[PDB]
Amino acid sequence: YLDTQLNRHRGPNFEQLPINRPVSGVHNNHRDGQGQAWIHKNIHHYSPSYLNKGYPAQANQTVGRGFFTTPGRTASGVLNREL
Amino acid sequence: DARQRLKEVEVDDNGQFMTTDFGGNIEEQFSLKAGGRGSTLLEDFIFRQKLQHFDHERIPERVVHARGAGAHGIFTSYGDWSNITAASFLGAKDKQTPVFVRFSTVAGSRGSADTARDVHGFATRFYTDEGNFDIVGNNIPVFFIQDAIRFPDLIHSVKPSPDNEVPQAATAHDSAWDFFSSQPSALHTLFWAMSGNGIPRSYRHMDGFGIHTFRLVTEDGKSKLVKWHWKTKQGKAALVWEEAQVLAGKNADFHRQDLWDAIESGNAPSWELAVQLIDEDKAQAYGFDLLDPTKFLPEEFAPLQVLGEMTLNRNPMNYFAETEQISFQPGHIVRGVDFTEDPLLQGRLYSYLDTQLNRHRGPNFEQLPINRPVSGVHNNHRDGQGQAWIHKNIHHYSPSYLNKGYPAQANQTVGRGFFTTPGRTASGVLNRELSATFDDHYTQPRLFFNSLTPVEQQFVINAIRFEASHVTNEQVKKNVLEQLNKISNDVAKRVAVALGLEAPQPDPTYYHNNVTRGVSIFNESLPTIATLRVGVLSTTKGGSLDKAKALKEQLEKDGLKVTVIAEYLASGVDQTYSAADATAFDAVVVAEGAERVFSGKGAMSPLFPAGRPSQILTDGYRWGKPVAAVGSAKKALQSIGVEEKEAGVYAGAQDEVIKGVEEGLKVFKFLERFAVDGD
Amino acid sequence: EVDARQRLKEVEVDDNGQFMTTDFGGNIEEQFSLKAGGRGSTLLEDFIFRQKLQHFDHERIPERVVHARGAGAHGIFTSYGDWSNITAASFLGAKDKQTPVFVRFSTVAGSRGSADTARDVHGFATRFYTDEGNFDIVGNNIPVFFIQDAIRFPDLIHSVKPSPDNEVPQAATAHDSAWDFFSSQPSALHTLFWAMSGNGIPRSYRHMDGFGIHTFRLVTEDGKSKLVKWHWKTKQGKAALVWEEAQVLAGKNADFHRQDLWDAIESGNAPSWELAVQLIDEDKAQAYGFDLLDPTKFLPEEFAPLQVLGEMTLNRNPMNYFAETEQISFQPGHIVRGVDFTEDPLLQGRLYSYLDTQLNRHRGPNFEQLPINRPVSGVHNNHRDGQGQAWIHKNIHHYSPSYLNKGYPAQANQTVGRGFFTTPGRTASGVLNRELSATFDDHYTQPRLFFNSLTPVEQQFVINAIRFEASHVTNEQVKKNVLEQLNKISNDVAKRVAVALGLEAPQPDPTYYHNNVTRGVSIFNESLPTIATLRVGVLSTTKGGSLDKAKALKEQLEKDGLKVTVIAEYLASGVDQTYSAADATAFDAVVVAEGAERVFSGKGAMSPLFPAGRPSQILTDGYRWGKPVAAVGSAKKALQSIGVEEKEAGVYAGAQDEVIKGVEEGLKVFKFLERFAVDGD
Amino acid sequence: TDFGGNIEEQFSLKAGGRGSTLLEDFIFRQKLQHFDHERIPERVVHARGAGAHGIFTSYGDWSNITAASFLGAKDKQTPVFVRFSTVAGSRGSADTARDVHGFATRFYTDEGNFDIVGNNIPVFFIQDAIRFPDLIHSVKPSPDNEVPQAATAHDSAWDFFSSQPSALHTLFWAMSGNGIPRSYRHMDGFGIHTFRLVTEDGKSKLVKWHWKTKQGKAALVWEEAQVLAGKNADFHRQDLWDAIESGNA
Amino acid sequence: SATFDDHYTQPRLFFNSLTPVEQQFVINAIRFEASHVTNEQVKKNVLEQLNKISNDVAKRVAVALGLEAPQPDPTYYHNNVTR
Ligand code: HEM
Ligand code: HEM
Ligand code: HEM
């Protein structure tokens, strides 16, 4: 689903389109790309960084209400091409 | 063989193990997982390379004529036409030039119905030894608009509404009818689209037209005005709207299959290439400007002269690579042919080259096997997305000492190069206006209508009545009727009745009783059959199958493919009753002893939907198709109220049914079965 | 004996003896626009103009997101023997097996038009056109990468590349953002030390060692695996420039390495590389004092000797840079039966990235159908359609499983149809997490092992590079943060850099301090095994019959394998380059011909042909850059005008017997490190 | 992420401690997909260049000579944006290379966007636009090896000038100080073509656009220019940036 | 148009309108650039074209190239100066 969008939209900024854009707000070091609709204010587009005071900051389970995978989830066994 | 040049790019995978796009044998049926019931790994290159290809399979459809189908062919010249044109594919006797034709609709999208009511496309590629030559035409000799700048306006109006994208492949909506009532130039093509030309039987039973006036330049530079025509050897045949609507649902690939089947069965379709020669000085002599795409030239003023014949003998191997990827351009011109100052043609030359960049994502679309010429390409073009070639020439500029002057310039005197007509001059002020000679939009629509049979003319009015009844705006309906009244007061009053509005005011300005030849569809008789689609309604009980097989054998003898319909797929059964429909066939014949299944207990079978056999017979008759009954099968016709002998309807023994049903097809559609106004 | 480009023949287009045509055929005249009169406007009906200009307007494709600046060559890989015991690979499957190759060398931060001699990590990417699929070893000239997790790649690239506000600087790491990242991501410190050394500014693509970086696996037919490290050892030997030379060369000839390769192949002296490997047992993955899944650490030669498998030589130059070099799309995911991936977090994310990026650069999925990308093995899969489909597929049942296609294309695996298989022993154990192993925590030991393994003068070049680069940081806190990180590697390194910055560096941290030394990391220790393809500049003059004496020196030198260019005021009988066109950066050896001392002093130096004091500058530059300088007979006065001793190490004076054999000796040394000032004097 | 929601983009999702990366790591993919597709094609010509925003002020009401809106008023302030550039040079080429320089100016008028896409030399090499690919293909790097970058010192370029004598005027300009200027600010701009200035009534007058620098014309020397291309390839790019920031616009 | 046929008058007007040292810079650029041409016939073709503008310009460039081709063609020769 992420891959196909590059064909249909011919670039990576398909999420900047009004119908796709979230209401939550976007803050990441993604720059450039076909049809960039935004002028980013932070010139230090990387992490870790002293210059950007640590912004955008990393969020996880305990900090900044970030996404996390289920802690109990484990991987066990041989790597295989079977069902 | 025409496909010979494609043999080098043809891939066989039989007897071969599955590989990645970059080589190496693989197993693409299981994802790489972290354990038995584990998550898929990013390190599974096999999955990604397989799915990435799939995710990016689709290219944009054509902005217009998205729905269509093609076939490969061979064009043969009837003689040396060097006296009329410097063209290479024409200046020799029995010269065989490979071709590829793509027929299509207009407003319809990629998945739209073949049997939708629209203008049909007729794009033809000539793989000449002097370059690719395209005659990007339509099945109607006239176009809606006079200036190419108005093309987005016409397309935006006819295509689905921008808010909901309703309707698909139809002109029965407010926007489309507002444009016709606001742009009176659109009225001629409308009358053609509202006729049989709008709903033809097949791509093979179509006449093609280049529309524009072109020029035919001789070696010396002398030009002659020309009009391209494609006359079908199969003859013009059209469906009825009531049939066409059911067919769009029952089989949306009706025309697509019709062509495919013809080539495979051996009966390849043919077309004669005719021209209308006109002197440069007689460009406005015929009562209209020849630079006008809304007007056509009658056969009475200029007879058609046959130049050769084009036959389609090969079907494609991959629809995408061949049919979908083919990129036609009316700008694909060769030495011997030249453009005219036709404002519609002028803007097309730009548009078709431009669009190619969207559809193909780059400039090397001409390097694609289906697009590439047989003549050879030697220019200074380099780079671009998906460069397929490795240019040996490092001095890719002109003029140059380093490349000894190669590639060399060719023109009229040297290297058989293309040249514009020497006589062609530019005179007057630069302006954004249209000639006063383009101001007549009502004479030509009436000439066509006056040249149709009484029942055909009804079909025109019965299409307008249908389409206009969909307009929600009261003022648009009145605006349409005001425009129709300017063509014919009879046409206007008949449409008005269906709309509930009364606006009859005869405007005798463009009224005339002149008639032109070769515009009618049903008037002429069908030449060969070769059509064909004959349905035999039989049954599994009472030994009717054995009697149906005998009829199937005798009827196919005259070069046909007859389909026997029964409850289930027995010994001689091709289609079942649930799978079959009257739209699929041109002739409906009920086999002897076919029950009791038409109105009795046999009609209620779990195999087919309630009252199906009766419906196939009912539909056929009401659609003007020749209907038949062998022996006992007379009760089938009586169950709905169909008399023994009238029009196409013939009863009797086995051989008595075969002879007569064949004569019915020559007529094709029985116009006497359709109600005309005034009765 | 055979042409490595034989497969691209099918697609070559000759236009010699042919008239100009359009892309759709038909002879044309593309030199005049169609106009409405004599002095009239151009007409839209001019299809010739539009079809010519449309192609031109759509010539450019996007450059590579990284490694944009570079040049390639075709070649032939020959196996030294049957390695079936170590790997199931086909190209390593037999003795003297010839496999076609194509190598592309590049930088990283530099854009399409950037200079070849800039201070960056160099790329070294090899395509193996195996009779079992395309196999890519997308490596660099440094054995270690900056980051440990592929997710951090955008962060590293965004930091090293030009600033987003003004797009300054081009092909350089001397800026706040780049140095903030190194001071904030201590994993980046090893590759930095390598980039700051001679490895960052090499002499040529041919005088480079290449490394696959990641640890890989070599699977046998039976399924037994062995951990492996790819290495490309140059038969030409490692040679690097000096920063002061490198800066002038970026301006004088930005296609320095591009020409160096092109010239070598055309002249006959084709470059060679031996393919070496480091074999390691699966059980000894953490046994060497570090995790082998770590791309920030390399394996010393003392623990695992290199084993040669074959040799790769580049014998053919491309015919069209675009179609071949620009359009080539490498992928480390281009794997074949016999080779397998490791759980290296940097490698893992690369497999995704490289396939993805091609959709931007090529604008579709059929990039593998392009002549340069297509394998020689043959393609049989149910992939259909897609932008620019170049093939007509014959099988109408494009799916699996299927009764209709008789089961073709058939599935291949380990036991059937010689298909690819993952290592059977490979297991997944533990919790799914977004963390990095504790075995990856050491970022200071390995940088110090490299530094301790360089010659005293080489160590200064590392110091000076950092001194140069850090002096560009405008932020005072970033400079302190850098010095704090450098102090964790070596207190000596930190104090020497601190001096140039004006700020002192506290306080000795003996945690990762050691005096261990590793072999094969120095560029300047070992002498060049060959002197061929080495440029020598002869400074001569049009007056006093010096040209005739210079031609004699040129003859004896050219027959040894060297490429000799005679410099004079104008293009006379034996003059190749003029004094205004020539520069010391272009040559490895600078020799002043007898009687050329006349253009060093007096009016001879003031000529309208060349800029004021040019001959003197070429000689001055060559000596200060450590290049072996020479003077024949009276030409001793030329060296004296700047203050150069005739008996110094690297300097040669005497006759046309002594100079010829004396100079070619100094070329083996390449660069005389004794001319460079070391701290402590 | 690009579709909202707080995340941690510093660690890949793995199957265990020292395990392989999972396809289910949407964070990694959405971050790398953006990066993988950051680059767009460079301009076919004038790939190397730099711009700045500005304000255009009219000295008076020129309604008598032109119907233009940005001109037919006294002290009328029209927003502008200028992009100066070289020609043969690619995206990463040196600012101090010897070439024709570009001077593209956008006028954000209240009656539409008006562009004067000029050059620092009043004359162009060729007379017919159809010959543009020939000129560019000749001046740009050789198609076999792609040597040289941002230079006209090669066989192909000099074959074209000797074969197309129209190219001789612009050559003399390119061979002069106009070919190696000190800065983008010390450049004169020219619209090259003759244009027409139409009044409300329809009366036209032939016109030639000119941009005269208030800073004055200043150029380097080739021997300096060669060293600068290596020492600082962003010489002109920084020169402009510094001027605006320092206040001296 | 035939009015486009003059390609030598305007180049000389520019050159005649430059200072003595500036004119040298023009010739010192051509001398540099032309010395890179590997083809002997291209160098002669260039000098033939330069001779059509000014015989002085042609003879000065010729010196650096090692070729001698001075034949004054007074057709488009003039001493006009522009500001
Ligand atoms: C007499 C008038 C016209 C005729 C007969 C005509 C006919 C056709 C046909 C038959 C096709 C599809 C060709 C194929 O099978 O691939 C087509 C496509 C198209 N037409 Fe027209 N057309 C006409 C006027 C116009 C005009 C006036 C324009 C715009 C100026 C236009 C723009 C296009 C475009 C953009 C396509 C898509 C072509 C492609 O993607 O390859 N057409 N036309
Ligand atoms: C050991 C670490 C790495 C090495 C040795 C390496 C080396 C290279 C080289 C040599 C090239 C250019 C290949 C060519 O000549 O065409 C390249 C391109 C590239 N690399 Fe890396 N790379 C490394 C890590 C990464 C990582 C971690 C990523 C992102 C996950 C990445 C993404 C790319 C991309 C997107 C390109 C452009 C490729 C193309 O357009 O074809 N690389 N890399
Ligand atoms: C007087 C003659 C010319 C001048 C002054 C001129 C000037 C320029 C300049 C200054 C640019 C870059 C604008 C920018 O900063 O973005 C440019 C771009 C370009 N020019 Fe020219 N040009 C000339 C002639 C031509 C001709 C004759 C053609 C082809 C018919 C052409 C095609 C282009 C193209 C395709 C680009 C790339 C533009 C883009 O990607 O936006 N130019 N030109």
CB B129 within 8 A of CB B88: yes
Instruction: Please state, in angstroms and rounded to a whole number, the distance separating the CA atoms of residues C403 and C638.
Output: 86
Quick count: other Cβ atoms within 10 Å of Cβ E83?
3
Instruction: Please state, in angstroms and rounded to a whole number, the distance separating the CA atoms of residues C98 and C84.
Output: 16
Touching pair A, E by Cβ (3+ pairs < 8 Å)? no
Resolution in A: 3.0
CB C599 within 8 A of CB C541: yes
CB C445 within 8 A of CB C187: no
Task: Give Cα B301 to chain centroid, integer Å.
Answer: 27
Instruction: Please state, in angstroms and rounded to a whole number, the distance separating the CA atoms of residues B431 and C36.
Output: 13
Q: B455 pairs with which residues across the strands?
A: none
Q: DSSP for B113-156, please give it.
A: -TTSSSPPEEEEEEEETTEEEEEEEESSSS-S-SSGGGHHHHHH
Q: Which residues contact B8 (CB under 8 A, 6 or more apart)?
A: none
Q: Dmax of chain D from CA atoms?
A: 80
Q: Which residues contact C151 (CB under 8 A, 6 or more apart)?
A: C345, C349, D9, D10, D11, D12, D27, D28, D31, D32
- Residue among B496, B424, B512, B504 at smallest CA distance from B464: B496
Instruction: Please state, in angstroms and rounded to a whole number, the distance separating the CA atoms of residues C584 and C249.
Output: 9
Distance from CA of A69 to the nearest CA of D (A): 9
3-state secondary structure of B577: coil
Q: Which of E3, E31, E63 sits opposite C580 (nearest CB)?
A: E31
d(CA D87, ligand 3 centre) in Å? 9
Instruction: Please state, in angstroms and rounded to a whole number, the distance separating the CA atoms of residues A43 and C163.
Output: 7
In this structure, the residues whose C-beta lies within 6 A of any atom of ligand 2 are C 64-67, 70, 104, 106, 123, 125, 138-140, 145, 150, 153, 213, 295, 328-330, 346, 349-350, 353-354, 357, 361; D 32, 36
Q: Which residues contact B449 (CB under 8 A, 6 or more apart)?
A: B191, B457, B460, B487, B488, B491
3-state secondary structure of C274: strand
The DSSP output letter for C72 is E
CB B566 within 8 A of CB B580: no
Touching pair A, B by Cβ (3+ pairs < 8 Å)? yes
Instruction: Please state, in angstroms and rounded to a whole number, the distance separating the CA atoms of residues B411 and B473.
Output: 57
Element (H, E) at C129: strand C123-130
d(CA C354, ligand 2 centre) in Å? 7
Q: Which residues contact C352 (CB under 8 A, 6 or more apart)?
A: B42, B48, C150, D28, D29, D32
Quick count: other Cβ atoms within 10 Å of Cβ E45?
18
Instruction: Please state, in angstroms and rounded to a whole number, the distance separating the CA atoms of residues B149 and C62.
Output: 33
Q: Which residues contact C73 (CB under 8 A, 6 or more apart)?
A: C102, C103, C261, C265, C314, C316, C317, C318
Give me the phi and psi of C296, to 5 degrees please.
Answer: -90, -10
Instruction: Please state, in angstroms and rounded to a whole number, the distance separating the CA atoms of residues C105 and C71.
Output: 6
Distance from CA of A60 to the nearest CA of C (A): 10
Q: Cα dist. C635→C328, C541, C558, C568, C667 in Å?
A: 50, 12, 21, 15, 20
**Inter-chain Cβ pairs, chain C and chain E, closer than 8 A:** 33
> Known catalytic residues of C?
67, 140
CB spacing of C417 vs B17 below 8 angstroms: yes
Radius of gyration in angstroms for the set of CA atoms belonging to chain D, rounded to a whole number: 24
Chains within contact range of chain D (3+ C-beta pairs < 8 Å): A, B, C, E
Residue C409 tokens read as 């294309």
Q: Which residue's entry shows tokens 């093939």?
A: C391
Q: Which long-range contacts (CB under 8 A, 24 or more apart) does B295-303 make?
A: B295/B142, B295/B188, B295/B440, B295/B444, B296/B141, B296/B142, B296/B209, B296/B227, B296/B444, B297/B227, B298/B447, B298/B516, B298/B517, B299/B516, B299/B517, B299/B518, B300/B516, B300/B517, B302/B227, B302/B276, B302/B277, B302/B278, B303/B276
Quick count: other Cβ atoms within 10 Å of Cβ B166?
9
CB spacing of D137 vs B402 below 8 angstroms: no
d(CA D202, ligand 3 centre) in Å? 29
The single-letter code of the amino acid at B42 is L
3-state secondary structure of B80: strand
Residue B150 tokens read as 């108005």
The minimum-distance atom of ligand 1 relative to the CA of B347 is: 30
Q: C653 pairs with which residues across the strands?
A: C631
The minimum-distance atom of ligand 2 relative to the CA of C105 is: 15
Q: Whose CA is nearest to atom 34 of ligand 1?
A: B352
For B447: left if phi > 0, alpha if psi spans -120 to 50, otherwise beta; the answer is alpha
Q: Which ligand is nearest to the CA of C139?
A: 2
- Residue among C306, E33, E32, C187 at smallest CA distance from A48: C187
Distance separating the N- and C-terminal Cα atoms of chain A:
23
Q: Where do the domains of chain B lie, and which CATH numbers do they carry?
A: 1-430 (2.40.180.10), 431-528 (1.20.1370.20), 529-679 (3.40.50.880)
In this structure, the residues whose C-beta lies within 6 A of any atom of ligand 3 are C 53, 57; D 43-46, 49, 83, 85, 102, 104, 117-119, 124, 129, 132, 192
Q: C392 pairs with which residues across the strands?
A: B10
Which ranges in C270-408 belong to alpha helices (H)? 321, 345-362
The DSSP output letter for C266 is H
Instruction: Please state, in angstroms and rounded to a whole number, the distance separating the CA atoms of residues D91 and C221.
Output: 48
The single-letter code of the amino acid at B573 is V
Give me the phi and psi of B559, to 5 degrees please.
Answer: 70, 70
Question: Does C129 appear as a known binding residue?
Answer: no
Element (H, E) at B245: helix B241-250
Residue B187 tokens read as 């009225």
Exposed / middle / buried, residue B22 (Cβ in 10 Å: 0-12, 13-18, 19+): buried
3-state secondary structure of B190: helix
- Residue among C246, C234, C215 at smallest CA distance from C107: C246
3-state secondary structure A4-73: CHHHHHCCCHHHHCCCCCCCCCCCCCCCCCCCCCCCCCCCCCCCCCCCCCCCCCCCCCCCCCCCCCCCCC
Distance from CA of E2 to the nearest CA of D (A): 12
CB spacing of B38 vs A75 below 8 angstroms: yes
Residue B429 tokens read as 């002020």
3-state secondary structure chain D: CCCCCCCCCCCCCEEECCCCEECCCHHHHHHHHHHHCCCCCCCCCCCCEEEEEEEEECCCECCCCCCCCCCECCCCEEEEEEEEECCCCCCCCCCCCCCCCEEEEEEEECCEEEEEEEECCCCCCCCCHHHHHHHHHHHCCCCCCCCCCCCCCCHHHHHHHHHCHHHHHHHHHHCCHHHCECCCCCCCEECCCCEECCCCCCCCCEECCEECCCCCCCECCHHHHHHHHHHCCCHHHHHHHHHHHCCCC
Q: Cα dist. B478→B500, C47, C215 in Å?
A: 11, 44, 80
Angle C467-C473-C477 from CA coordinates, rounded to 5°: 105
Instruction: Please state, in angstroms and rounded to a whole number, the distance separating the CA atoms of residues C241 and B149.
Output: 62
**Burial code of D168-206, b = ≥16 C-beta within 10 A, e = fewer?**
bbbbbbbbbbbbbbbbbbbbbbbbbeeeeeebeeeeeee
**Burial code of B440-450, b = ≥16 C-beta within 10 A, e = fewer?**
bbbbbbbbbbb
Instruction: Please state, in angstroms and rounded to a whole number, the distance separating the CA atoms of residues B9 and B20.
Output: 18
Residue B72 tokens read as 């490969």
Q: Which residues contact D202 (CB under 8 A, 6 or more apart)?
A: none
Instruction: Please state, in angstroms and rounded to a whole number, the distance separating the CA atoms of residues C446 and C514.
Output: 10
Give me the phi and psi of E47, to 5 degrees please.
Answer: -60, -35
CB D136 within 8 A of CB B398: no
Instruction: Please state, in angstroms and rounded to a whole number, the distance separating the CA atoms of residues D234 and D48.
Output: 10
Instruction: Please state, in angstroms and rounded to a whole number, the distance separating the CA atoms of residues B158 and B65.
Output: 13
Q: Which residues contact B117 (CB under 8 A, 6 or more apart)?
A: B170, B171, B193, B198, B199, B241, B244, B463
Omega into B508 within 30° of 0, i.e. cis?
Answer: no
Omega into B239 within 30° of 0, i.e. cis?
Answer: no
CB D37 within 8 A of CB C360: yes
Instruction: Please state, in angstroms and rounded to a whole number, the distance separating the CA atoms of residues B1 and B16.
Output: 27
Q: Whose CA is nearest to atom 5 of ligand 2?
A: C139
Q: Cα dist. B489→B189, B483, B504 in Å?
A: 19, 10, 7
The DSSP output letter for B25 is B
